[model samples]
Target: AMTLNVIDSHFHIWDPDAQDLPWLAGLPSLQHRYTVDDLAAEYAKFGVNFLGGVYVEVDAADHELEDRLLYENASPLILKRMLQGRVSPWMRVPINADGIREPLHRGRALEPEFIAGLRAMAAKGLPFELCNRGPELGDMAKAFAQVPEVTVIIDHLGNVPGLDEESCAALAALAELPNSYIKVSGDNPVGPDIVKYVRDTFGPKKVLYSSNWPVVELNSTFATHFQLMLDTFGEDEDFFENNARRAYNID
Candidate 1:
């Protein structure tokens, strides 16, 4: 039997040898190099036709230049490139701020410069990816919406760990933003039964399917998440295929 053509909306490819990744030092298991060839071979095994991979800013040695260069250089090879950065403006609370005092101070001080960078990328017609601060993602959503030219896609349901009133409110506000999109990835490890809640909140149209692989191999069975979606939504194949295709501009 044939499977649905999958377009991975989120993933990372890093070459520690060629580039410096300060973040990987913490993840000893993932400290090695991961090339597009490595990822492409894995996708081929699963029969993925194309991948709209957004490089999730991996705290590189040169945070600004290296990250942007990675996306710019990798775009031709990959389906589409989405620009992502670890900015306090769209990060989680105390942890995100406290973790990077120097970086946050830099980001705050260089707000105009960062926004200029975003605009420059937007001028080049690149979509931006963001992960919102738990309860404040809604605010970030509105913030991003203000930038009409920059198409923004939110990662991991705005990194909302659980489905609560705050999350629901944030989801609602975010969904209302015309330029916003959401990815239902990386939730399995966070809590029990977040898929349904995510689907219901973001709706089939706004949500895109992603594996968030390697980081958290929560499910031993690769097809479990897809099967769960199929089981829950019934014969709505269009929900998965159409939404992803349209959002990613897949042919």
Candidate 2:
């Protein structure tokens, strides 16, 4: 009916004290440091075991420092919490000439920076998160297909506010890629059809769970994420944790 050893595939940690999080200047609630203790305590309140989490990059100036700190202070309970280094169009990613070049008219990626960064990461078996939405979703996947090494994680279920024909077709196209996976996160309602669609489309293996954490608190609690539509997983224990283990390349 349900599962355990859950891995939150998407959640973030930031510190205004040590990092330049100018983006959180107006958002007071999310401005503080989310320590392991803090997150563990909240998970305990929910009557859930605080398993590992993936530290998503949030454009902090001290991203490298954050990586050092977490690894230096990691504990057994959360020792495997992985970090996805943030990539933005602003920062010129150092890429080599080994990457492919696409035509501008295809609406696919022509950015050398993105291609280079993605190439290096994929070569090292690191996963890339795709946050593109709508029609851009399919385009992003098409671009990724050019380099089969990329292990793509489609964030926010292709960043759709609601599941529709367009979104479904777009997501379906992305799902066709063996190198790509999908994260069942955000506050989008998971009803019978959508839930079944996700389960059947990605199966219980490629699909993983995520709360998006504090931002999710803006709409639903950490528990509410696992609470909804768990039935779709059926008896597959991997839906709770195993899938994420493979997605993030964890043991």
Candidate 3:
């Protein structure tokens, strides 16, 4: 029997009333405000020691304000911002986020301006999260190739639609990128096939443990999901903590 500390590399917190989250309109489970207190309660239920983690950005209208609210609320929570058109403006502001993410639900990763923006982000030494659909994994991989200097993290195992050959091939290609890593958390939290594929493809140090949290509640409990991951990669301490530290550059 053993225990490991965790740093949730992809956690999120949002208050619907405070900002416009068009994405949450149809997602009834995530409609209400989710604060740091709620996360504490959830972790308490599992009896896991709470180590502060990275705060991923939700698609809120006012990202700057959103970052401020989270920064004010939590200590030692590494933050991330939603990248839109430009990167330098975000750099100019003192948001204090360690990473950046532009949810690629749409296939704009290869666009000229989009590539340019990400390159600037890379120059600042910030890692980017690639949160996109399964089918678009190939396109995202292709786009990331242009900006080789930046470390791109694949979120939710590319949100693979199924365990088909095409999806498998696409994921394999992305994993081939030296600077790319994968977070083993998503809507389908404990899918064994996906988990094994990630661990095999990304190797021990590159596969990170994350609880997509409230969003993952759609599929599994926060504790249950983590336990399942522990069952799968229990011996690999980096899977639970160190990989996230490297991925998010957390201290």
Candidate 4:
């Protein structure tokens, strides 16, 4: 049931030694450098062929440099900010990216400016990825509902700390949107129940599998997370490969 070539929908490759990662100051485990080659080595451990990865932007002082490094060094696809904080002139500046992700703040979705930014993204034909966990999912669902033209990819099962009525309902609300998709990634020890719910709600075709990589290492090993996703959604080609390809418009 497993696909030979797997496209990780979301992960990161950062060189903290060369680049400044203040966030890593507290986390001793991920203080070292991580590259695309490093990721391949880990995938080799489990016999999973590395087809490509969606290199997500790491919040560094010089984001452009980080983007440039990944593009030059290694990357299958990249998701950088199209809305570069100010959300005005930068929208007109073109950047080579497969998709867009602005990260999420609590209650960020309903903001007028944010919605305007999403509309701008839609005009560029780029899908927006959201990593909002629980309560924010409802806000995201609402915000995204207004912009049906923009493809919405929900990352990490909304990064919920176990499912509840609110989370379930919010996911369902998002699934109601025709253009909405969900990634079965993030968190350690995410069990079959959440996996099943995501699949059933988004349907097998709209679901994407992501390893969340090095960050995921804090809770579980990369091999363990990849295998778990494969075991659950591997039966569907879309889960491992096609969904990401189509959602991100990967050639």
The candidate that achieves the highest lDDT relative to the unseen native structure: 3
- Candidate scoring better on lDDT of 1 and 4: 4
Q: Can you write out model 2's per-residue Cα lDDT over 1-251, one digit (the tens) per residue? A: 22245666777666678778756777776777776566667667656555767666565556466556656665554534444333333433223111111212134354566666667667766667666545566567556766677777777676665577777876777677777778777645444556567768876678877667666765566656656735445434576678777777767
Native-to-model Cα distance after best TM-score fit, residue 45 in candidate 2, in Å: 3.2
Q: In model 4, how large is the Cα lDDT of residue 198?
A: 81
lDDT of 3 by residue, 1-251 (tens): 14447667777778888878888877798888887678767767766666766677777787677667765765544434433223332344334666777655555876777677667778777888878877777788788887887888888877887788888888888778777889888877557877887778878878877888788888677768877876888756687778877776766
Model 1, global lDDT:
0.55
* Candidate 3: pairs in clash: none
Best by TM-score: 4
Candidate achieving higher lDDT, 2 or 3: 3
lDDT of the structure predicted as candidate 4? 0.72
Instruction: State each model's C-alpha RMSD to the native.
Output: 7.0, 5.4, 2.7, 2.6
Clashing pairs in 4: none
How do the residues 58-97 of candidate 4 rate in per-residue lDDT, one tens digit apiece? Answer: 6666766765665566344343322223332145332656
lDDT comparison, 1 vs 3, better candidate: 3
Candidate 1 vs. true structure, TM-score = 0.69
Kindly report the root-mean-square deviation of model 2 from the true structure over all alpha carbons. Answer: 5.4
Score residue 162 of candidate 2 by CA lDDT: 54
Off by over 4 Å in 4: 1-3, 74-94
